[PDB]
Design a protein around this ligand. Structure first.
Ligand code: D5M
Ligand code: MN
Ligand code: MN
Lengths: 433, 432
C-alpha cells in the first residue's frame, strides 16, 4: 500500500534523468536522422537464449544451466549441472560465464547446421556488455597473471595451446550429439578436464603456501587516489618517470594450494568462454538484441542513452510512437585491457572486433510497441532486414520462442537432485535451506 | 532430467568436502569439546530480520525494503521504497547496505523499548559476514577517498560531523514514530538529504565543464591523498613542478558530475550504515543466528561450515545430539574495511575491533540442524538468555521474524508503476 511518502522522490529521480536527457543532447540533432525500417529479406535463422537457476547448500552453490536455440530448423538445447563452493560475488560471475559460454557455443554450432542463401543468428543481449566488462573481472584477469607467474611465461603458452586444442576437439565432439539428439548434457569443458591439467603443469612445480610476483596492475586501482607523501619521497624525477615505476612495479604474494587450483580453474573457464566468443564471431551475420541494457561506462569509451529513456524522448518530443530504426554514427571499438596481449593471438575474430568494432542501432518493430538495442558484427543496413523476415508481430517469433521455451517455471532439481543425495552417503548437507 | 554423471560429479564434489573435513585437522580434537546446552535464564528479547524486493525498469532499479522486530514487546517495523540508476554490482550492493541499515536500526530501537533484568537482541545473520567483506566494496572505500581528495580534508570532516548530526535527529524522529504507530516509512536518511549536502560541499567546489563534466580545483591540508588522475594529467612535467602547482592550487581535474555525485551518495550511505552498526553495538547482549554461512575466507582468516560438521558428527561420533560448541578464541575484524579516519567517530566498531567476536556452533534440539551463533560477548553468557525463548526445533522470536518478514507478496507489483502511470510517463513504467 502506501510508501507514498517516497513516491515523488522516485518520480523525480526518474524524470530528473530525462529532463536532463532532452537538455544535454540538445536533442543531439540525431533523432531526425532517424530512418524508418527497410524491406524484409528472406533468411534462415536461429534465436537463442539460456536461463540459469541457483540454490545454495551451506558453502556450496548448485546450479543448472540451460540454453536453447529455436529457428528455421529443429530445437537444439545445451544444458549443464554443477556445484561449486561459494564466494558470494565470484561464484555468480562464474555461473554467468558458463551461462554465456553455453550461448556462444550454441550460437555458432547453430550457424553451421543452418542451410540457406541468407543465414543469421540472433542473441538475447548486447555484444558490448560482454567485452566491455568481463564478468568475474577482479578474478579472471588476476587469475591468469597469477597462473602465468606461477608456472612461467612459456609453460603457460603451451598450457593455453594444449587447452585450445582440447577445446577445438570439444566442439566437434559436441557437434555430434546435436545431430543425433539435438541436445547435450556437457556443453562445458573446463570442469572435467581441470584436474588432469593441474597435475601436469602445476603439481610438478608446487611444493607444500608459495611465492609469486605480479604487477600492482593485475587488480586495481580502487583507490584510485594516491598519498601526497610519495611525490615528496620520489622527487627530482619527472611525472613520466614516476608513472612508469608506478604502473610498472611488481608486488609479491603467497598462494595456498586451493588458491592455485582455483586460479587454474578460473584461467581455463575464462579461456573457454573467450574461445566461444571467438568461435562465435565467425558467424557472418551476428545479431544481438536487447530490450534493456544500460549505458554506463559505454558513453565513456561516446555519449548514448538507454532505449527505454529514448523511447520516451521521441514520443513526448517528436511525437512519433512510430516504427523504424536509428543507427548510431560511430562504429564503436572494444577496450583491450579485458583482453590480455598474450591471449588475443588465439582468437582472431575477437582481435578483428577490436579493429572493426560494433555497430549499434535502436529499433522499433511496431507502432506503440517499443525500442530495442541492436548490435551486430556486420552493418545494421545489411543485418537488419535479415532479422526482419521473421518479425511475427510486436516482434520476431523465433526470439519469442527462445525466450519462452528455455524458461524454467519448474526446477527439475527442485525435488529431484537433493532427494537422491539423501541416497548416496550423506543427507545432512541436503538438510540445510 | 539429469546426467547422473553430473549427479555423480555433484555428489562427488560434495563428498570430498566431508572427507577432507573428516581429515580432522583442527576437527579431530575439537568435536569432543562439545558441551551440552546450559540452563535457560529469564530474558527479554527482540529477534529482528528484514527482507527486500527489487525490480528493474530499464537502467533503473526499484527496491522495497522491510525490517521486522518481534519479541518481548509489540511488533516494530521499517520500510523504504526507492530507485537507483543501475550499475550491476553497485546498485544491488547499495540496496543490501540499506537493508542492513534498517535491520540494525530496528535492532537498536527495539532494545531501547525493552523491559527486563536481562535484555537481548536476536539478529538473522552473522556479525562476521557483514564486516569481513562489507557490502559495496572495494567501491565504498575508493569513493570515500575520492571525496577526501576532491572536497579536501577540512571541509570533509566538516561534512562528516554535519551528516552525523542530521543522523542523530534522524534516529530520534524514528524512535518517536516507532512508539506511536510501531512503524516508519522513512528509515533511510541519505537519499533525502544527499542533494542538499551536494550543493553545500560539492557544487561549491566545482564549475561546469564541457559535456557532462566538471572542472575541480584540488585543495591542500593526515594523509593528503591526491586523486590518481592528477599524475595522469601532469605528464610532461617534473614532480617538483607538480607539487608547486599543487601548492599554488593551480591544479584542476576534469572528472564527471555523476561519478562525483554518485561518490557522494555512496559515501553517505556508507556512513549512515556505519552509524547503524555502531548503534546496534550499544546492545549489551547482542546475538546473531545463521543456519548456513560461509566464505573461502571463512577458513583462512583465522573452523568450518555448519552443515559439514553437522554431518561429520552423526557420521562419526553418532550424537546427532543437542548442545553447543564454542570456538575457543575470539575473532577480531580485518581492519582494512574500516577507514581509520572513520572509526574515530564510531567507538563500538572501534571497540568491536579490539575485543572481537565470539562464535559457537549450536544445535538447539535433537537431530535438528546446527546454527552459527555469533556475539559481541561470551557464548556462555548470551546462550542462556537466547535459550529462554526456545520454541521448538529453534527459537520463536526469530521464526516469527522470519515468517513475519516473508510477509511480502509483491505490493508494488500492480501498484507503484500504476501510479507512475499517472504522473506523466508510463513509458519506462512499460518495463521498457
Ligand atoms: N555476466 C555478464 N557480464 C557482463 N555483462 C553482462 C553480464 N550479464 C548481463 N550483462 C549485461 C551487459 C550488457 O548490457 C548485456 C550483455 O548481454 P550478453 O548476452 O550476456 O552478452 O547484459
Ligand atoms: Mn539471455
Ligand atoms: Mn535476513
Amino acid at each position: 500500500l502506501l510508501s507514498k511518502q517516497s513516491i515523488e522522490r522516485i518520480t523525480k529521480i526518474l524524470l530528473d534523468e530525462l529532463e536532463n536527457v532532452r537538455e544535454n543532447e540538445q536533442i543531439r540533432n540525431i533523432i531526425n536522422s532517424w530512418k524508418p525500417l527497410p524491406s524484409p529479406e528472406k533468411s534462415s535463422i536461429y534465436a537463442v537464449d539460456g536461463s540459469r537457476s541457483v540454490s545454495r547448500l551451506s558453502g556450496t552453490v548448485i546450479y543448472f544451466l540451460s540454453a536453447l536455440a529455436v529457428g528455421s530448423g529443429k530445437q537444439l538445447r545445451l544444458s549443464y549441472a554443477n556445484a561449486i563452493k561459494s564466494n558470494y560475488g565470484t561464484s555468480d560471475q562464474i555461473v554467468r560465464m558458463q551461462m554465456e559460454t553455453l550461448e556462444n557455443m550454441l550460437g555458432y554450432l547453430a550457424y553451421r547446421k543452418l542451410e540457406g542463401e541468407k543465414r543469421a543468428i540472433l542473441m538475447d543481449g548486447t555484444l558490448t556488455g560482454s567485452l566491455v566488462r568481463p564478468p568475474v573481472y577482479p578474478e579472471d584477469i588476476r587469475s591468469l597473471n597469477v597462473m602465468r607467474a606461477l608456472i612461467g611465461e612459456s609453460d603457460f603458452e603451451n598450457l593455453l595451446n594444449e587447452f585450445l586444442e582440447k577445446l577445438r576437439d570439444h566442439y566437434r565432439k559436441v557437434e555430434e550429439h546435436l545431430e543425433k539428439n539435438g541436445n547435450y548434457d556437457s556443453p562445458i569443458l573446463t570442469d572435467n578436464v581441470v584436474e588432469k591439467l593441474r597435475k601436469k603443469y602445476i603439481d610438478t612445480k608446487v611444493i607444500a603456501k608459495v611465492k609469486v610476483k605480479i604487477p600492482r596492475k593485475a587488480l586495481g586501482y580502487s583507490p584510485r587516489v594516491i598519498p601526497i607523501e610519495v611525490l615528496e619521497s620520489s622527487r627530482g624525477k619527472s611525472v613520466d618517470e614516476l608513472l612508469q615505476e608506478l604502473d610498472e612495479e611488481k608486488v609479491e604474494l603467497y598462494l595456498g594450494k586451493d588458491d592455485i587450483y582455483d586460479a587454474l580453474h578460473m584461467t581455463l573457464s575464462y579461456i573457454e568462454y573467450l574461445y566461444s566468443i571467438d568461435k562465435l564471431l565467425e558467424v557472418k551475420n551476428l545479431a544481438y538484441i536487447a530490450k534493456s541494457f544500460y549505458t554506463k561506462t559505454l558513453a565513456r569509451t561516446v555519449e548514448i542513452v538507454d532505449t527505454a529513456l529514448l523511447d520516451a524522448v521521441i514520443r513526448t518530443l517528436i511525437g512519433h510512437e512510430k516504427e523504424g530504426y536509428l543507427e548510431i554514427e560511430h562504429a564503436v571499438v572494444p577496450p583491450k585491457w579485458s583482453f590480455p596481449d598474450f591471449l588475443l593471438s588465439k582468437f582472431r575474430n575477437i582481435e578483428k572486433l577490436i579493429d572493426k568494432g560494433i555497430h549499434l542501432a535502436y529499433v522499433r518493430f511496431e507502432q506503440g510497441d517499443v525500442i530495442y538495442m541492436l548490435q551486430s558484427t556486420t552493418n545494421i543496413e545489411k543485418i537488419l532486414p535479415l532479422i526482419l523476415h521473421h518479425k511475427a508481430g510486436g516482434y520476431l517469433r523465433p526470439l519469442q520462442l527462445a525466450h519462452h521455451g528455455v524458461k524454467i517455471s519448474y526446477k527439475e532439481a527442485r525435488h529431484t537432485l537433493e532427494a537422491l543425495i539423501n541416497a548416496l552417503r550423506n543427507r545432512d548437507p541436503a538438510l540445510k535451506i
